[PDB]
Write a protein that binds this ligand. Structure first.
Ligand code: NI
Ligand code: NI
Ligand code: NI
Ligand code: NI
Ligand code: NI
Ligand code: NI
Lengths: 100, 101, 556, 556, 556, 100
């Protein structure tokens, strides 16, 4: 696979997101690292799918609502940023005020 | 589209051009396979191979660099040899020359 | 004896006339020459050529190379040629024909008991990359760049502090000293940039005497005519380079006033197109000048569909300002000025609006997008892209070396230079190399299961090798110092452990010296439309949909 | 020119009178003072103040600081104040007003070409923590504590061996020597504890002369009156500290007999409440004494619903015995004696009934649980928790420093001490810091994608920085030795590479010297009920249901 | 006072007569002797024996050990015995009875203030393994082998280059030098093998003088009569060993001609069965000779159902050739010649047709498969497998040590040798050790959650300890050099930091000296059937279905 | 669990395979590292199941077809190799020309 350090690092982010995805499925309100992992892994899969930077900036705001996360969480995450390989190379997506 | 593919120019390549060559009949009189590499000092191969050693003196097999010729037990072939170049000094092998020729 | 050309290519790698596609791009290289004698190539293995009395001779160590890379197809600014490469005392010994002179003809790289072998047949070998726009935000950037094929890192910083996050500056003798000591731990050659912004030349001479090989003038520290003038006076005095991030705000003057302050003195303009920083909207016009060595940083290489959305937000994250800075018109033209030889170096802008492991892949993405849009360069001679390939490889190898006065040690595969080499399988050319050699030892390479019967079973990922460990790493990397620091014995005073190299020729280099990238166009930027023109012709291009060297290779 | 107080807080961080909630606790700090001149704050960036001729001056390196942390809100035992912090030669230069004296008024921290900047506006800055109860079970505890904001680690051990698993002891000159050499590899300041249990003082003087800065008396090696007496005689002789884990079994006498053996000599009683070890059920009464510096270890901080189940089993895993040792009554009282200043230090008991990355967070959990149960301290002055905050921060900073005779080098943000500082975003105060600085260089910090365009994209996790690498790490950490070892040249004999500090004042320190934690209560423990009383009043508290600094922050 | 034998075993580990199953194998060891005085065993803990005035005495450091491993059940070539082990100055001090002579009888390992303790009760303790067939393909193989219980690694290579991928050779003085410097970073003792194939003895003397402790003759470099003769002449001259991978192709002669070229001189034949390389199909017959020290590499240990499919493909991946090389007949016989003492060492062939972390587990799998097929060895005395266990442990400990002239420093648990020891829980014997000690310090061990209250909560995985860090690691490992390199001051010239050991006795050792493995059978291989016979009797065995030390232990 | 370096390393390969397994489920054509991870993790589970080296050499060629992977992918993977603990110890499986 000839994985570079940056690929192995995203492997960690993906796994942290699996933890959150299973907890949300059980009906828990997510905490800070959980919420950041879930949304950011989601944005990595949208780049893999060939979605645009512009689209993912908006879709990323619909992954978690104020109701699915603990108190204070929305205020601890003013944005979430993650880069992924889009069909046109690595791009930065910043999802602004993601949780409402 | 194949990533990193070659576009090889058609044709053939002539190897060891300009060098002296000879052919010698070789027979594996041993009972175990013997395989000889392209640059080995032919005259000094496994004693079980029978051929005119005097003829092969200062020669190697005239084959693609890196490749070898195999002799099963009892197998008999005519091989083509090409003379060594450079200083034509042979050291090693069976320790039979160990100097110039 | 004959062998068909296909069998021959299969056995020893391609020869004269054969072509190779670079990765999944539309770029094709054609072998220009082959330094072998057909029938006499050396290959290592069971029953192969490199064996005692055969391709391997009787010589003592002094009379043979330490390492031979067999049947490499070299891609460098000087040619695309098939050859054996001999490395001796950590340096490039010869490019030629390896073997034993006792029995082989034309041997120029002698192989003996003291010679190790790396089998390069079927691979492409390049010099290691040289990235001159590093922000020392974290030490992790070292392995990241090294894995990408970048062997020399020049920049400044002290770690994740606001000054370094913004600028390539290691401020002051104490941080410079700490950073030189920290460099010994990293498996890449390193040179430091001090903070160039001050109007008292003594505070700069002190940083230079401390060890910096250049000075960064950055607008966040005030890129004023006076600061720029002071740093250039010191640079001329101490033979060190000045890298410039200009006054985007046009606070102290317009790009012509900064130009009047440089006064025809040598300077390296970072991110010359201007999205990474500089006089809005016309910093790009700096590439017209003979004393300017212009580089681009990488997030705008090449221009793509997501480029603007991404950058506009990126800039906002780090309104009339944002808009005067990020412009499609200058972004669209930069790919072409690279194509034309008007921009000379590519570099990262590491974790400060640039990607540390993407300097080489993006440089190639741009060559592909230009071939696709513009066709063959006027310089091209046969049915291949050899000239364009030499023009772009020069941008991340020899040109950054010359710009920073280290081309005497690194930058290309040439006799006498440090043996920093990168071995690539053509399918992964420019994205994932097969082997990264630092000063003659392999420093990082893809490696499979450590417990496996062979080194190839999964998972295969980049792992540091022997040239990346302790004192062998120190022996195989260089720390670059100024002539003043070297003369004052900074190396001995800080007990630096690595080999030391000294920069020189940082003031003498000019645009005419950038290999295959010496164009000085009569370039303008329209104040109102921001269109870029050279002699009245609009310089522009179209954003890529999809790029090669992207989704086929990367897990994320 | 005016600016509203909210805009001002948004721009430069909070000022006099403004309040800040510590993490998700009920604790609120109020800015007591601000050392700036309104209009003259320094901020770094594009068009900002810290630029040549402006907030940055013309001075040579000697005349300016190496580093400035701008607009920090300092929380330390001496005050909660807004100020710029200047660091020079790896040490705290000044707490005051940074800038250029050529154009700015009241400048006490001069900024020049040689100055790097860390932007502290909106952050809280503290001294690095000092954990004095480390078991050297594994070297991994170093980064773990450092990430938590702990910069100094004192303890003993040789790795995962039975002696170290049980006690904080590095037995003998050879292991002490190996451990001093191993310390050079770790990015935290370290001092070693030798095995104090022996009745022949020469075997202790040898360990002291070898390099230990203290001696651990632990009941697993026999915490008898004679052993304790011998170690105290040596400690008095060589100015090194004695840390005590007493005879829980009451084998050699009761807590009064151990008390008679110490004979009014200075000693640090580890886990003074007694669940971590000590005379059952009354070791807690040691905090009444003037010569006792008492600490708690962390698993009983604060008292919670799972505490007893967890500890009873924990103790069984490592019956009348278990029950005499783990007691709700002494566990419930310890939170309050911390609240009252009767217990002076918090510490871990690393991987030996304590958690190495939880000393700071638990100390704060206890302050929160006490505010919640008890209200404001008698010492409080305004509508904030400033006094309680200074009382508890002193427990993991200055008090452990004073206890171990290293307060001259570390322990607080004061001029002349080592620049070990921790930068926190208030939302993550006490749990996950923004930046950990060791002797003036950042040694560890959260770091996003190494290949990203900025340092913030995900995954963000703690990665070692330049102050944690090789010889820069050695320059930025201290190895503490005894006066005897320093005088005998142990540093030179073991070729230790780090900077060396010498402990002193380990016998002179007493309970009256523990900052904001000098209470000597007339404390009793009932033999039958184990109730704790001070002057007849029952000291008790309720177990927490839920704590702040817990599930909102941690992935597991 | 009496205690039942079961309670006694539970408290102190098993004693004379008790038996222990090795892991999940069918192998059982019986305690042969116990060096204690019943009632006087030493145990460390709360209220235990090792406390001041009790099991711990008043002696100064010089008069006590640095470390005691209490109640260990030693398994070594010389016996399976219960004893305390004292380690002092990084070396084995005594095997006997630990304690305080002031109150205890028969004390031979004195314990004082300067003594650390590792509790070995219920564990089995062995010497560290010695793997002599390492290909230095990557530095990661070091920790991998160390975790497996292998403390000494001998081999050659320069990293992931074609020469090293194929052969255990570090060619030439420059690579030898770089590899000696790199060795300082690794926590295992290391000796290097140079390239032995050349017919000019001076090119070999140079490699020897450079630091190699042996020379590898490999057919990929031409394993001709002349090359072999030259290396043996040098080896005899410089007291260094020759390791042989013979001419599989029978190019220069048959196995008898290679045998005539060695001419009765000492040599170590690698992978003697021949699937890993050698004269097809009869290299195996080399074990008949008195001057041959024969080892096997590991992928054919033991013979199993997947063995042939796997190897035939493996060999094809790295037709009449493949088939002449991989043979069921010689593969089936090798297990038995190991059983018989005719093959003397086991080794890996690391990432070059062998598995670096499987030398010990496979050696035990073979002992189990032989007990299962063949029953008790003729040498067995009681109802246990003690003789077979001593016969096989000798294959990866003392025999490789003697073969390489380092048995004076390592190879067994004997007084005066380096304290390289491995502590095993019997259930995980041979697969996952509890503690790996390098020269007296623990260098790697399983370690649970670094932040936990104890070192046991999950995840538990192998982590490097204090004996694996910087200068403590250098103090605790050896770099082995030739007598010539040591005399020429190679250590000082390369500034090697580790302790240095010198090999000697590499020519004098012979088959009669391989502990419990000295058989010289009249072995033949049929040219046509490849059947192996010793004195006309067919030597063969059946492939295992399933093995112990496999799926019950490993996650993948 | 006393995980050795080699066990923790296969943990990485398994996770890289989870990424690919989820993308293939969404109907994407897999890329190079994805395809190598998916097949190799599959072979590790067949060893765990007690299948033979010989069998896994053939079954491994039926995991991904030319249609489920991007262009050039089949040509970038002439074989995939991975070792796992079979009931009879660690064995190397090479899956030759896996994708057609
Ligand atoms: Ni810039
Ligand atoms: Ni920059
Ligand atoms: Ni304790
Ligand atoms: Ni403790
Ligand atoms: Ni071999
Ligand atoms: Ni081998």
């Amino acid at each position: 696979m000839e994985l570079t350090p940056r690929e192995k690092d995203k492997l960690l982010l993906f796994t942290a997101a699996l933890v959150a995805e299973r907890r949300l499925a059980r009906g828990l309100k997510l905490n800070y690292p959980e919420s950041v992992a879930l949304i950011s892994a989601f944005i990595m899969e949208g780049a893999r799918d060939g979605k645009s930077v512009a689209s993912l900036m908006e879709e990323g705001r619909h992954v978690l609502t104020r109701e699915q996360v603990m108190e204070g969480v929305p205020e601890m995450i003013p944005d979430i940023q993650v880069e992924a390989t889009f069909p046109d190379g690595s791009k930065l997506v910043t999802v602004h005020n993601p949780i409402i | 589209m194949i990533p990193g593919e070659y576009h090889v120019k058609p044709g053939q390549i002539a190897l060891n051009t300009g060098r002296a060559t000879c052919r010698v009949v070789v027979e594996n009189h041993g009972d175990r396979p013997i395989q000889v590499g392209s640059h080995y000092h032919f005259a000094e191969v496994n004693p079980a191979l029978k051929f005119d050693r005097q003829q092969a003196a200062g020669y190697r097999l005239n084959i693609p660099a890196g490749t070898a010729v195999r002799f099963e037990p009892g197998q008999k072939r005519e091989v083509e040899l090409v003379a060594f170049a450079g200083h034509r000094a042979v050291f090693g092998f069976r320790g039979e020359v160990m100097g110039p020729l | 004896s004959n062998i068909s050309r296909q069998a021959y290519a299969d056995m020893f790698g391609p020869t004269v006339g054969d072509k190779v596609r670079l990765a999944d791009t539309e770029l094709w290289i054609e072998v220009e020459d082959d330094l072998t004698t057909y029938g006499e190539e050396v290959k290592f293995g069971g029953g192969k050529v490199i064996r005692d009395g055969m391709g391997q001779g009787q010589m003592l160590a002094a009379d043979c190379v330490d390492l031979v890379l067999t049947n490499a197809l070299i891609v460098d600014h000087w040619g695309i040629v098939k050859a054996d490469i001999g490395v001796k005392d950590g340096r490039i010994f010869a490019i030629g024909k390896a073997g034993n002179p006792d029995i082989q003809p034309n041997v120029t790289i002698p192989i003996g008991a003291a010679t190790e072998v790396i089998a390069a047949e079927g691979k492409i070998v390049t010099a290691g990359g040289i990235d001159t726009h590093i922000h020392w935000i974290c030490p992790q950037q070292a392995e990241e760049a090294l894995v990408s094929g970048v062997t020399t890192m020049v920049g400044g910083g002290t770690g994740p502090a606001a000054g370094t996050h913004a600028t390539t500056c290691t401020p002051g003798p104490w941080y410079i000293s700490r950073m030189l000591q920290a460099a010994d731990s990293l498996p890449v050659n390193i040179g430091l940039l001090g903070k160039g912004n001050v109007s008292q030349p003594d505070a700069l001479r002190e940083q230079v005497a401390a060890g910096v090989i250049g000075l960064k003038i950055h607008e966040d520290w005030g890129a004023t005519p006076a600061a720029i003038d002071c740093a250039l006076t010191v640079a001329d005095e101490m033979d060190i380079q000045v890298a410039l991030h200009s006054d985007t705000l046009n606070e102290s003057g317009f790009v012509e006033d900064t130009l009047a302050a440089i006064g025809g003195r040598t300077i390296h303009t970072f991110h010359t197109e201007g999205a990474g920083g500089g006089h809005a909207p016309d910093i790009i016009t700096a590439c017209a000048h003979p004393n300017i060595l212009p580089s681009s940083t990488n997030p705008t290489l090449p221009y793509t569909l997501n480029t603007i959305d991404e950058h506009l937000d990126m800039l906002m994250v780090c309104v009339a300002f944002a808009e005067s800075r990020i412009r499609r018109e200058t972004i669209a033209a930069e790919d072409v000025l690279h194509d034309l030889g008007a921009f000379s170096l590519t570099s990262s802008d590491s974790q400060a609006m640039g990607r540390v492991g993407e300097v080489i892949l993006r440089t190639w993405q741009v060559a592909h997008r230009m071939k696709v849009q513009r066709g063959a360069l006027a310089e091209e001679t046969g049915d291949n892209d050899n000239f364009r390939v030499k023009r772009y490889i020069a941008k991340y190898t020899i040109n950054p070396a010359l710009t920073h006065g280290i081309a005497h040690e690194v930058g290309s595969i040439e006799v006498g230079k440090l043996a920093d080499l990168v071995v690539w399988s053509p399918a992964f050319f420019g994205v994932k190399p097969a082997t990264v050699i630092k000063g003659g030892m392999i420093a990082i390479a893809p490696m499979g299961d450590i417990n496996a019967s062979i080194p190839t079973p999964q998972p295969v990922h980049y792992r540091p090798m022997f040239g990346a460990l302790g004192s062998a790493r120190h022996h195989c990397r260089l720390t670059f110092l100024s002539q003043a620091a070297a003369a004052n014995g900074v190396a001995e005073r800080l007990n630096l452990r690595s080999a030391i190299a000294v920069v020189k020729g940082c003031r003498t280099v000019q645009k005419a010296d950038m290999v295959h990238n010496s164009l000085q166009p009569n370039i303008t930027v329209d104040a109102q439309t921001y269109e870029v023109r050279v002699d009245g012709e609009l310089i522009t291009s179209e954003p890529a949909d999809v790029l090669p060297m992207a989704q086929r290779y990367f897990l994320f």
